[PDB]
Amino acid sequence: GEHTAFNQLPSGKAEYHGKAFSSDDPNGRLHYSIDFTKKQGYGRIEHLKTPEQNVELASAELKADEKSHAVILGDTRYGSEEKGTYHLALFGDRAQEIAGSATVKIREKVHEIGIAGKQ
Amino acid sequence: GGEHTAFNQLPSGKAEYHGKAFSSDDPNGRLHYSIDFTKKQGYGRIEHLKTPEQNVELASAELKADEKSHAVILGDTRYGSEEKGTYHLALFGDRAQEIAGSATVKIREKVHEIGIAGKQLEHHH
C-alpha cells in the first residue's frame, strides 16, 4: 500500500521476486535482496528476450527521498559495465513490496524497464 | 547519444513530450508531459490504459539535479485530485530530447507500477 518511511524500516533482510517489463516485453523477472541492517540492496533483471536488458541492479544504498520514503537509487550493469540507473521504492509496514524502474542504454538507445517485486 | 541530460545543459522555453505508458498487464497507454524549462517545472498525464484509475495526472513538480548532476523530476500521481502515489522522470540527450521513468498508482491497497517514456514533440520560447 503506502510508501515505507525510511525511519520506519523493518529489521534484518528481505528477498523479492516479481516482474520486469519493458514497453515491448512484459515477461521479464526481477530478483532483489535488501539488507535492512546494512542499508543496502542489489539484484538483477532476467528473462527479457533482449539479452543486454537482463541487467545487474548493482549494490546501492537504501536512503530517504525528499518525502522521507525509503528508496534505492543505483546503477544498472551488464558484463560489469554501467548501462544506466535504477530507482526502487519500498511499500508496506514491513517493506513487503518494491516497485520502480530501470534504464538500460543499448547502442545509444535508452530502454525503460518497469520493475515490481514482493517478499 | 542516449546520455542523461546534465542539469547545466537544460534548454529554455517549454517542451511537450508524447510517448508510451505501460503497466505489467497493459502496454498500450500514452504519456503526455510538459516541461517548462524556464520555471523548472513539469506536469502531465497518463491516458489510454484499460484500467481507468491508472490514467493518472502526473502533478506539477520541480525539475532539479540528482546526485550525479542529471536533470530529474520527482512528483505526485493523482486521480480525481487525490494523491495515488508518485512518479519519477529523468531527462535524456543534450537538449532533453527524451524523458523516461515510472509512476506508481495505488488502487484498493494494491500498488501498480507504470513505465513511462516520451520524446519531444514540440518546443517553444
Residue numbers in the entry:
A (entry chain B): 201 to 211, 213 to 320
B (entry chain A): 200 to 211, 213 to 325
Paper text:
Attempts to grow crystals of a complex of V2 with fH67 were unsuccessful. Although crystals grown from a mixture of these proteins did diffract, these were found to contain only the C-terminal barrel of the V2 fHbp. This agreed with the observation that V2 fHbp is prone to cleavage to a smaller fragment consistent with the C-terminal barrel alone (not shown). The structure of the V2 fHbp C-terminal barrel is highly conserved with respect to both V1 and V3 fHbp even though it shares under 65% sequence identity with the V1 protein. To further examine the apparent instability of the N-terminal β barrel of V2 fHbp, differential scanning calorimetry (DSC) was performed on all three variant fHbps. The DSC profiles show independent unfolding of the two barrels with the peak representing unfolding of the C-terminal barrel melting at temperatures above 80°C in all three variants. The much reduced melting point in V2 fHbp suggests that the tendency of this barrel to be cleaved is due to unfolding of the N-terminal barrel, giving access to protease recognition sites within the N-terminal portion. The instability of V2 fHbp and its susceptibility to proteolysis are not desirable in a vaccine antigen, and might explain why it has not been included in any vaccines in clinical trials to date. Such instability is less likely to present an issue in the context of the protein on the exterior of bacteria where interactions with surrounding molecules are likely to stabilise the structure, rendering it competent for binding fH; however it might explain why more C-terminal residues appear to be critical for fH binding compared with fHbp from other variant families. Overall, comparing the amino acids in V1, V2 and V3 fHbps that reduce affinity to fH by over 90%, V2 fHbp is more dependent on contacts within the C-terminal barrel and less susceptible to alteration by mutation within the N-terminal barrel than V1 and V3, where residues critical for high affinity fH binding are spread across the surface of both barrels.
